[PDB]
């Protein structure tokens, strides 16, 4: 495609990607390591309920 645009500016017409945000995963990691025994409680109940349903 023939265009009247200089070669130096060719990289400036494209939208560069941005790094996605990551700190929700880190505060989630902190909150899950914080409450480990209760999370294991709830996971045990989930597994027992699933096996009772099946």
């Amino acid at each position: 495609r023939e265009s009247t645009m200089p070669d130096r500016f060719r990289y400036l017409t494209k939208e560069a990607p941005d790094s996605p945000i990551i700190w929700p995963w880190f505060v989630a990691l902190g909150f899950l390591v914080y409450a480990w025994r209760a999370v294991l409680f709830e996971l045990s109940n989930w597994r027992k309920a699933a096996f009772a349903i099946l």
Binding site: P6, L12, A16, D18
Partner: protein, 105 residues
């Protein structure tokens, strides 16, 4: 231009106002012509996810304001007007050191 770019969190890179870089290419010697240029340059830097403005961003912003988009593009078929522009630009560069140079194409 500097105080309009700095107020939006965009720090001017320490090479054009630190040297004679962007003084020789800047124009639009009137008000309301620097606001549009500043907005275009900030838009170009935002599309690159950057916060600093280099020489290329200013040049690409100046090129988008004083140039008309055109279809059915054709170039010069007689080299010999190219020498006219080359000589005038060289003379305007060396001799009149206080005047702009429009790009040659």
């Amino acid at each position: 231009f500097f105080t309009l770019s700095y107020t939006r969190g965009f720090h001017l890179e320490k090479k054009m106002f630190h040297t004679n870089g962007f003084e020789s290419i800047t124009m639009g010697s009137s008000a309301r012509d620097l606001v549009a240029l500043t907005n275009e340059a900030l838009s170009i830097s935002i599309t690159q996810k950057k916060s600093i403005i280099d020489t290329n961003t200013i040049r690409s912003a100046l090129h988008r304001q004083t140039w008309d988009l055109r279809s059915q593009v054709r170039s010069v078929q007689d080299h010999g007007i190219l020498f006219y522009q080359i000589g005038r630009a060289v003379a305007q560069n060396v001799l009149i050191s206080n005047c702009p140079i429009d790009p040659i194409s």
